[PDB]
Structures are given as structure tokens and as C-alpha cells.
DNA sequence: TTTTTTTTT
DNA sequence: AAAAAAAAA
């Protein structure tokens, strides 16, 4: 992706350059996917100038009507992670795919940070053991990251303890406005160095406390509605595989399973592809594929043990 | 449909032509269907010739009153397009229609995008096996296209695979200005080659994060009136069948199905035929006919599986 | 931590931090952690003033993407608090740690009310001998709080005995609203002194009788979150280890242990290290741990006698 | 015109 | 084996 310094080749002066960076359009990609209402927001940003910055930016990217056959080879470059065990890959038909967001939800015991903890080492891996390359990054909202785990799994793969712990970016939110905020720096990250999986742990923890009652529900679903919405922008501009954790609730008094998820009806159509995690006889759990746009619905089986997750 | 090289007919200079172009009234039937209002504010165009370009147009086409005994005729060539099963052809009457707009919603595994991958292969078929013939129209904008759903459904018809996947045109709408600049791409395309189904796949994903809150909602309902005008206007053009994909909402305070699709009173009264898609023994999904000119209230089976949807 | 005294070096008048201290942000961090929307609810505060206090506030705190190199070097400091016991230090690998929120259950005779008894003695230790320094805090609902008990753990280790029962904070609640107003006091306390475990025993005995009824569900739970969201926001203030003690229930009508903790998955998810405590031959009891994120599932040996919790 | 939450015994 | 309530933009 091409950094936005090649927009002094229309003749914008340098300092509207700047001002973008403000606003987060770190790349040329984020001028053109955005639209023109949200770019006259901006100070210092007129009608003539947005009118001109859109349209030269529509030079360089292609946006337009394309042969679905041509659409299907861009599709078999797409990276898999793999996910430490064939147990799960035979689920995925090769793992989590990049460009994407996946969520994982499950009660309370079902390894959802330990999945998460697994895939921050696969994803620096050589591309012929499976798995891309970059480094990783690390969102977390309840305050579990514990490093220790992250170094049992270099023990698995062999790879060198302090290139692997060294090579991960983390950042604890404290609350809905922080965890926002944190976005914005990661998008000016990913313009130098090559990256993978940017891993929410967990994305809606912090929604069920700063919003309360049914009085503050539609202030909170716009504004997880646009959080959604930036996840979805960061994985078509980088190429970047996004991983989102949710948490459950009962339903007392519904009539014949009975957890299902947080969020309503916005994280369920914002996500494309989920995943149930339920626990069995506790050395092991069951993964279980609840909607995907191409994966018929099926079922395996975990391993939680001392060097991630395995077979 | 007459192309716009009938109008140096009137004596029109040939660079009025090449203006309407860049307006998108590709069609002869485009001016005359276009109201005086809209016409003078393409940039060069006068009162005067404005008043002879309408009128001019009025001789090509026929609008006027007839008799509903020869409208009665017209309508016995209407294609209708199968879905795949017998059951919901059971439903339509013979399936999707041609001239019009269909609309289905659901929430969240209802198989929305599985009914639209496997139109765009029952849209080539000879007229014989059902269907109509041309190619088809993929609009996106969530970024689920997959083109592995489209070989197993050519699978299972006989087709070849790649005859199937050349004739497939793809584009991804990034944000609401760039859906409705799709549209014009769209009309320009239509007149040298045979078409059939375009798909908005789902056509108010995007217009719930771009527009937020009760201040912008008036601005939000003009822009998707207008986008819902223009593809009226495609249909009678053409004869394009459009299929619109929806999302739900709850509502949290009601009392006594509760969820009830977005857009308003406007995507309500713009769409004539309207779909409800729900899940039950999840092997199979449940279609209800939710609003029609024509068909009765009524319900059907499903089928998701490997070769699209089936009995 | 620093106190909100270092805000008049922006340029606020010394009302203002005044008012802060009502509404219980006495120190600096617990400005840069708390959301925008939350500070506007304080009287007197403005929307222009509210950006410039938080803005200020993340001067001074460091939040942003880090290193988890650099993380782990910061976990190499956490203090681990000893039990009383060697068996229960051979299961959490050195003893409860700082930081985090610590939940024991069980039926009845378990020992939940000796294991807090036994950590108000260890946490006054020098950090030679296990556990770290500073005093204690004990919030009682049930009114079991016995302080002959203390004297003979100070008999154990051979401390003082005035000067451990004089270093012990006691507050007793009587509703689950004074529950939640004993907590501001709290944090007005940490600012002056060192200090160690927050005791909540226990925690949920109140909201078993203010609230009843499924009707009266919803209501309950939204003030049980909200009062775990204040127990984390004490725990990475002042670095303060926090135990609390939970009930169980009986399920009649499930099929094949069957005594689940109440709290629902509110609770479940909000507390990140179980213990699960259950009777034996009872001069002994057996420790479990149920869930957390870096200690494996296994079992341990108790012992109740004259002198604590012991082997 | 928008926006679901919440397990007891 | 059988149970119910909740609101603001
Ligand atoms: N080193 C380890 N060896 C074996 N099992 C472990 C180890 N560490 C953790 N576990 C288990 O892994 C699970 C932890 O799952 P985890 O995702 O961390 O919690 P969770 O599902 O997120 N629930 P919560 O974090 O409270 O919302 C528990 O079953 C632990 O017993
Ligand atoms: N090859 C397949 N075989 C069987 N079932 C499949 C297959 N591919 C997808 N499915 C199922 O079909 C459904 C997909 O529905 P789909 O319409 O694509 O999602 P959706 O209803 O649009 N929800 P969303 O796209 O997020 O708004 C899920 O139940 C999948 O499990
Ligand atoms: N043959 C039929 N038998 C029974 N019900 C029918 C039949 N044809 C249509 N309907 C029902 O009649 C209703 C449609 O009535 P209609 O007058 O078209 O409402 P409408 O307001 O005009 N729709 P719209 O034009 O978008 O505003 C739907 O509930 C259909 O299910
Ligand atoms: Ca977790
Ligand atoms: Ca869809
Ligand atoms: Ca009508």
C-alpha cells in the first residue's frame, strides 16, 4: 500500500499532507475508501480542494467493475494462520484467512484468550510451515496478556524466545473511548513494518459496563457500530486478518443452546465469520462453525495443554 | 433499448450528445424518462434545446395512454428467473421476475448471500431449463463474494466452470457516495451486452455507520431514496430483475416477529416484492412471503447445502 | 500513583479539583481511565474544560502500544502473596498476585471467611518471609469478620499482636447501595498509606434478597457490573490484589459437580482466577482451580487447625 | 426512525 | 418443573 506522499504529484500544497495525518488517512487507500462528507470534517479542508483530493486519488487505486474471473486469482494469494493443530485447520480448509474478521465466543473456561495467545506465534512462522509473516498485535481490554504463555509455544515451533516476544505490539484500553483511540495509532504503524493478526481481546467487555439500561442501548450500539466499521477498513487496506472476542448472556425465559451472543443484530451481520466454543470432558473442548459465508456447518475438537493449543 | 446515436436525427449538433454521456443517459429512453428539471443542469444545456430534446425523444418512445388488454399481452413475455428448488418456485409462481425489484432480510445465517450466488448461475441457463439468458452483476459491501459457491453450483447444472465465472461482472462499494457511482458504470454497460440480475448485495450495510444519530437520519433517508429511484429506473430500462439484500433491527420496548427490517417507510414502499427469511431445524431455513402485489401470504421450505439451494 | 494536585500545572482553576474529589477521582490515573462521558456528570463541568482535563491527564500517564518485551519485565515485579500453606503455594506457583481480582467458592463449611482471616496476617510480612507489605481492608457483608481469629495467626508467625489488629480497616455493609458507596471511601484511604488486599466476603450475599424475581433480574445484574467494574479500576490503580467470595446453588433438573457459583456470566467473566473448595474428610479440605488464564487445572490438600490455614 | 438486556432454586 | 420485567435520543 502506497503511503499518501504521493499526493504531491496533483499539486495539493504540503500542508493539507499534514493535516490528514491528523486524521488518521496514513495511506492513499484510506482517502479513496473514504467518502467526501467525512473528509470536509476536517479543519482547513474546503469543497474545491475534497472535490480534487478524491478524484486524483481514484488515479491510483482501482475501483471499478472487474471479470469475476480474474476476482478468483486474487483470491489464491490470499495467507491462512494456522491455528497449532490439524484438528482445526480441517474445520477452516487451512485456517483463519486474512483480509477478514473472525469472532470467537463461548463461556468462560473455552480457551478464547488461549487461541489468541497460540496465533501470536504462528503468525511470525515461514509461510511454508504455515501461517504468514510480520509481527503481531495485541489489544487488550480485561487485562490478561501473560507473556509467559506466549514463550511455551517458541518452545513448541523452536523459534528464539526473545524474536518472538519482541516482535509483538501491546496496548491495554481502559475504556470504550480509549479502545477507539488505539486504532488510530495502529493504523500509522502498519505503513512501515509488515504485519498479521490484530487481535481484539475481547471487543465487547467494555460495553456492557459504561452503557447501561435500555435508555443508553441505542448510544451504545452506534458507536460499536463504528468500531466495527474501522476494523473492517484496516484489513482491505494492509491485508490484515482481524480476530475479535465475544462474551455471552441467558435468556430467562425463552421456551424449548441458550447463550448466545452480545452485540444484537450489528456484530452479528458486521462479522462474516464465527466460531462456538463449548467445553466437553475438560481435558478437551469443541469448536463448532456458527456462520460463514463458505464453510458448511461441522464440528472438531481442542487441546489445551502447555504448549498452546494442540491436538 | 434504442442507444442515443438516434438523436442526430432531430439536428442536434454531435457534442450534445457526447454531453448526455457524461450524464449517464446512455438510453433513448433515459431522456425521455428524465424529467425537464433534471436535464438543464448538465453544464452547456439551455431552455431552448432542452424543450427540443424532450420532444424529440417523445417520438422514439410510446407514453400514452392504451388499453390493459395489450398490457396484458406484454406482461406474458415477463422471464422468470428459478431459484434452484421446486419449492420456491412454488412460492413465486415461477420464480423472480423481470422489471422489478425483490427484496429479502433475515438476520445472520439466513442464507441471503446463498440465494444470490446461486441466481448468477441460474441467470444463464437456456430458457428452456428455467431462467433467463445474459450474464450477470455482483454489487458488494461487505466484501462476501466468495467464488468458490459459484463451481459447485456449475457443478450441478453441467455448465462449464470457466464460461461461468468469465460472465460474472464484480465491484465492491466501499461507502455510500461509491454505491451510487457504481450505478452510472453500470448503465454504460448494459447496452452492449445482454444482461440480467443485478445484485446489491446488501444495499443498507453502509448507510447505518455513515450517516449516525436522530440529527442525520433526514439527510441518510434522501441519499437511499434516490439510490432506490435509480435502480427503478434500471429496470424499465433494460428489463434488469433487481434483487436488494436487507438487515434487521430489534425493538426494545414494544409488547405483544420483533425484528423488523431497516430503511424506513421508504425501502417499504420503493420494493414491491419482499421476502422473510428465517431458520429453523438448521438443516433447513423457512421463506414467507412478506409483501406482494400479486402472490398470497404463504411459506415455504429450504435447503443450504454443497450445490447451492436445493429441496 | 500521583494525586490530582499535579493539575493546576495546565492552568485549572483549584475549584475544579475540588469537585473531583467528590466524585471520587482522587488520584491522576483514575482521571486518564475514566471516559469523557462519564466527567461531563460531575455539576459544573463543561464540555470545553472536560477536553482539556483528559488531554492533560495523558501527559503524565503512559498509554500507547508497547513492547512486550518491555511488558514482561514489568510482570517480573508483581508481588505474590502467600497463603499460609505450601500446598496452595505449589498450585498458584507463588501465591495470589497483585493486580488482579482473585474468586473463591464452595458450600457452606469450606473455609471461604478462614483463607481471608489467614491473608490479612501475610500481607503485613516482610517480602523476605512471602507476601508483600502494607495494611489491610476488609468489607463484610454477613457481619463475620472474628478478630480472635487474627491474634492466632499473629501467634503463628511471631508477630505483635496490637500492631496487626491495629493495621486492619473493617467496614460492614448493610445493602448492596452501601456495598457500592464503601468503595469511594476506599479509594480516598490509598492515596495517604501502602496498602494490600481488598476483601469483599462476600460479595454476592446481598444481591441474593434486595433483588428477587426474574422481573427484578435485569436490574440486579447491571449493578452487579458496574460494582466489578470499580474493583478493577482499584486493582491496577494502587497495585492492590483483590479476593472475593462467592455462593453456590443447586440445579433441580439437569442430568448426568452439580453446584454452580451464582452471578450468572457476569461474574464469570469479570473474575479471572477461581478457586473451587470442597470438603473431604474433614479435618482437611481441597482447593481446585477452575479457571484461569495461566495456571493448569489441578488439585491441592487444606488443613483449618488454631493457627490459620495450614498444611 | 433508530437500538436488546438478564439466570434462579 | 416453572418462573418477568426494563427507555432514552
Ligand atoms: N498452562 C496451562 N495449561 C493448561 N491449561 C491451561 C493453562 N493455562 C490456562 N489453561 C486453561 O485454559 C483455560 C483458560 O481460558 P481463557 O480463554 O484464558 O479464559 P476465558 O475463556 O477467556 N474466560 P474469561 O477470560 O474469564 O472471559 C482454562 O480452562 C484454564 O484451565
Ligand atoms: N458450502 C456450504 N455448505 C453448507 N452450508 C454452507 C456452506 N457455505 C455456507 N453455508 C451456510 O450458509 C449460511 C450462510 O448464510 P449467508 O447469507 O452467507 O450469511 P448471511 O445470512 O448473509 N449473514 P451476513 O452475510 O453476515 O449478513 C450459514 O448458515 C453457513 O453455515
Ligand atoms: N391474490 C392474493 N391473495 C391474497 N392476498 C394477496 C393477494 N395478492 C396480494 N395479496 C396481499 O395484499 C397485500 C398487498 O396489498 P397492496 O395494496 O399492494 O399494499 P400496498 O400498500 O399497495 N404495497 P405498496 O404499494 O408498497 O405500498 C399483501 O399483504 C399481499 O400479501
Ligand atoms: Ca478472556
Ligand atoms: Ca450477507
Ligand atoms: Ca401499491
Redo the contacts with the bound molecule.
Keep these: 500500500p502506497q503511503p499518501i506522499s504521493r499526493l504531491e504529484q496533483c499539486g495539493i500544497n504540503a500542508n493539507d499532507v499534514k493535516k490528514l495525518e491528523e486524521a488518521g488517512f496514513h495511506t492513499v487507500e484510506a482517502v479513496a475508501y473514504a467518502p467526501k462528507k467525512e473528509l470536509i470534517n476536517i479543519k482547513g479542508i474546503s469543497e474545491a480542494k475534497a472535490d480534487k483530493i478524491l478524484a486524483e486519488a481514484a488515479k491510483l487505486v482501482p475501483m471499478g467493475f472487474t471479470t469475476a474471473t480474474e476476482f478468483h486469482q486474487r483470491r489464491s494469494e490470499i495467507i491462512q494462520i494456522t491455528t497449532g493443530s490439524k484438528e482445526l485447520d480441517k474445520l477452516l480448509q487451512g485456517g483463519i484467512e486474512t483480509g477478514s474478521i473472525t469472532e470467537m465466543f463461548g463461556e468462560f473456561r473455552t480457551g478464547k484468550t488461549q487461541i489468541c495467545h497460540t496465533l501470536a506465534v504462528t503468525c511470525q512462522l515461514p509461510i511454508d510451515r504455515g501461517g504468514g509473516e510480520g509481527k503481531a498485535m495485541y489489544i487488550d481490554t480485561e487485562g490478561t496478556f501473560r507473556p509467559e504463555r506466549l514463550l511455551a509455544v517458541a518452545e513448541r515451533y523452536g523459534l528464539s524466545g526473545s524474536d518472538v516476544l519482541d516482535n509483538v505490539a501491546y496496548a491495554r484500553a481502559f475504556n470504550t473511548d480509549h479502545q477507539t483511540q488505539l486504532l488510530y495509532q495502529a493504523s500509522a504503524m502498519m505503513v512501515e513494518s509488515r504485519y498479521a493478526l490484530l487481535i481484539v481481546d475481547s471487543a465487547t467487555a467494555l460495553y ?1 459496563t459504561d452503557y ?4 443508553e ?3 451504545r ?2 458507536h460499536l ?1 463504528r468500531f466495527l466499521r474501522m476494523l473492517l477498513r484496516l484489513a482491505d487496506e494492509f491485508g490484515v486478518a482481524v480476530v475479535i472476542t465475544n462474551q455471552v ?6 421456551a424449548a443452546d ?1 447463550k ?1 451472543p ?5 456484530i452479528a451481520h458486521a462479522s462474516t465469520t464465527r466460531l462456538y466454543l463449548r467445553k466437553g470432558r475438560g481435558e478437551t473442548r469443541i469448536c463448532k462453525i456458527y456462520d460463514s459465508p463458505c464453510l458448511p456447518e461441522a464440528e472438531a475438537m481442542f487441546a489445551i495443554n502447555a504448549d498452546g493449543v494442540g491436538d
Tied chains: 1, 2, 3.
Aim: aromatic content about 0%; glycine content about 24%.
Design positions: 456492557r447501561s439500561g435500555r435508555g442501548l441505542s448510544a450500539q452506534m457500530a448472556v441467558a435468556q430467562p425465559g425463552g441458550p448466545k452480545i452485540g444484537g443484530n450489528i
